[PDB]
Structure 1
Amino acid sequence: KVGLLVMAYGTPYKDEDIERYYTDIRHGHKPSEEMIADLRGRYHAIGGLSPLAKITEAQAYGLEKALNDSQDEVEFKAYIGLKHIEPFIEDAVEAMHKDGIEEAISIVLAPHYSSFSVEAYNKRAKEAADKLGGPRINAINDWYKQPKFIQMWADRINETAKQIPADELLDTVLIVSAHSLPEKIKQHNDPYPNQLQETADFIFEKVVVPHYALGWQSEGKTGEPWLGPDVQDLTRELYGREKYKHFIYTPVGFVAEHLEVLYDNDYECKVVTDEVGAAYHRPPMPNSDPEFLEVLRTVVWEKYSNL
């Protein structure tokens, strides 16, 4: 009945895909052999390829089932629309149209909104809808305010923090982060940095960890300022000022274990904590955990109810 357009970045299915994938990320402008080798190396450092493709499938169809098992007002049919590899956003909308789906709710697998992320997802999805003639795309822009989302993260952080000696929890700090973007989005009151601060604040309101700070990660290869501080620079800064013994990294901008977590956090950030002599913690990402599917099920239903 109702189309469930679940959108995410996408990831190379094969080592042979890294090239066209990176090209699509660079809006067609093919990267150099050096850029490709750096990216391929990062993928190999996390075991070869990312599990994002399978986690994304599990989230998309785990969400479809969660919605369908919880009510019978409508039947949701989930179509996956990736940003930089097939099936693309336009392919998903094409499938919805050919399948007779005339109404759909779209959600990005990223809780926060920004001109670079969700807006691009929604523009492409809605423009594909306009051209094909359907379906009608009712887009969710953000859902970080979903109480179950905040609680999910607080629980994970609390699960980890209660593994920290009480006499060292005062020396523990929570690093909330998301994918960095060009700092210029802050010049036009882009909500992204604020949604992250709000998310960090909400989660801090509900965890035992007494210290927290908002960082950014995965800044791109460009020649303009990107949002900071970077989680690595932040870790250094915080150890210098407070000598924290435990760093709990929650890249709440992401919803799955993928390259931007398995490398930029589990490697690059751990390198810094190893350096300063502090402990590294990175709670499990939501992936397709039942409570996260419940978060998405709640977000999508509240959206449908408001249609």
Structure 2
Amino acid sequence: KKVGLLVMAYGTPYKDEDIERYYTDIRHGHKPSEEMIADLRGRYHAIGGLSPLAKITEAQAYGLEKALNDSQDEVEFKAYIGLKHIEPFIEDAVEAMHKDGIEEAISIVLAPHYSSFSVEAYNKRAKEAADKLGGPRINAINDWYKQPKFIQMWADRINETAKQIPADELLDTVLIVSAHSLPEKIKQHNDPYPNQLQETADFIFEKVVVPHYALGWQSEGKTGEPWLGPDVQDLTRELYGREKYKHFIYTPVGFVAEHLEVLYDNDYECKVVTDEVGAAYHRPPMPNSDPEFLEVLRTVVWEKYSNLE
């Protein structure tokens, strides 16, 4: 008997024509205006037309399945992809697990940090789906940024970039560690997300040769409420004003793949600012399906499985 591996991620439009219904899902079912739709479509156009997130997410889910199954023979894992905002939805994945006779599953979100807005919603939807179906039992992983191989992965990528910076400009180099912003109100109830990002930045910092670092947030939404900051664009300007850094290295460690909110919100919007101030822009490769990242996820899931049994 197999163990279901429910791999959850945000989702991305497969076709240009999917953007409207995808955006409507993000907006809790309320259809955005033509102006809002045009702006989002323009951002997808600016990164090449569509996001590669769908193919990367598949490569991560099935690469994880293979890493687990090749490394042991206590159990057979079978991966099921469940997405937040487009088919196959979380609910579709849980239904396929049930139809296939899966009775026990482990779930993981392709985002290493926990928050009430992100991972908690994934877990709630998966559990409510399985409850209405009668199975499988879903054993949820909430976060995994503490995994040492995850920290070392990011540190290695940062050090490889730092080694190509002129030795006498390393003192003028800063590491910007970021993740997707959320409404500032989550701080009012001690949601762990801001502290988990600070811990990740601290863990990475002690393993890199870059002498300066700062925590920032990116991709805040179109609401009328305050969001966690500073925003990476605003922080870049402020740090240049204060310290005149020559190199900015962006690691949006809240994310695990190259998608719209790295290819646009870092590689376009942050580079606009470094260009304005006369500094150099650096953004190390995202984890994607690199074997080192697949080994991070394998360690996480296998530790979870070993602790259930």
**Superposed pair shares fold, TM > 0.5:** yes
Q: Distance in 2 between matches of 1:174 and 1:76?
A: 37
| Superposed displacement of residue 224, structure 1 | 0.3
Q: Distance in 2 between matches of 1:186 and 1:160?
A: 33
Q: Distance in 2 between matches of 1:205 and 1:75?
A: 37
Which secondary structure state, in structure 2, belongs to the residue aligned with residue 264 of structure 1?
coil
Q: Distance in 1 between matches of 2:202 and 2:85?
A: 32
Which secondary structure state, in structure 2, belongs to the residue aligned with residue 114 of structure 1?
coil
| Superposed displacement of residue 112, structure 1 | 0.1
- Residue number in structure 2 paired with 1:14: 15
Q: Distance in 1 between matches of 2:36 and 2:269?
A: 18
Q: Distance in 2 between matches of 1:59 and 1:234?
A: 32
Q: Distance in 1 between matches of 2:97 and 2:276?
A: 50
Give the number of equivalent residue pairs: 307
Q: Distance in 1 between matches of 2:186 and 2:234?
A: 21
Q: Hey, which bits of structure 1, 4+ residues long, moved more than 2 A? A: none
Identity fraction in percent: 100
Which secondary structure state, in structure 1, belongs to the residue aligned with residue 268 of structure 2?
helix
| Superposed displacement of residue 142, structure 1 | 0.2
| Superposed displacement of residue 43, structure 1 | 0.3
Unaligned runs of 5+ in 2: none
| Superposed displacement of residue 290, structure 1 | 0.1
Which secondary structure state, in structure 2, belongs to the residue aligned with residue 78 of structure 1?
strand
Q: Distance in 1 between matches of 2:193 and 2:99?
A: 34
Q: Aligned runs of 1:280-299 on 2, under 5 Å?
A: 280-299=281-300
| Superposed displacement of residue 19, structure 1 | 0.4
Which secondary structure state, in structure 2, belongs to the residue aligned with residue 170 of structure 1?
helix
Query: Could you list the per-position Cα deviations for residues 59-90 of structure 1 after superposition, in whole angstroms to 9, with x for gaps in the alignment?
Result: 00000000000011110000000000000000
| Superposed displacement of residue 201, structure 1 | 0.3
TM-score by length of structure 2 reads 0.99
Which secondary structure state, in structure 2, belongs to the residue aligned with residue 265 of structure 1?
coil
| Superposed displacement of residue 119, structure 1 | 0.2
| Superposed displacement of residue 270, structure 1 | 0.3
TM-score by length of structure 1 reads 1.00
Q: Distance in 2 between matches of 1:163 and 1:305?
A: 41
| Superposed displacement of residue 166, structure 1 | 0.9
| Superposed displacement of residue 238, structure 1 | 0.3
Q: Distance in 1 between matches of 2:98 and 2:194?
A: 35
Query: Could you list the per-position Cα deviations for residues 157-191 of structure 1 after superposition, in whole angstroms to 9, with x for gaps in the alignment?
Result: 00000010110011000000000000000111010
Q: CA RMSD in A?
A: 0.3
Which secondary structure state, in structure 2, belongs to the residue aligned with residue 222 of structure 1?
coil
Q: Distance in 1 between matches of 2:90 and 2:206?
A: 36
Q: Aligned runs of 1:51-66 on 2, under 5 Å?
A: 51-66=52-67
Which secondary structure state, in structure 2, belongs to the residue aligned with residue 104 of structure 1?
strand
Q: Distance in 1 between matches of 2:271 and 2:249?
A: 10
Unaligned runs of 5+ in 1: none
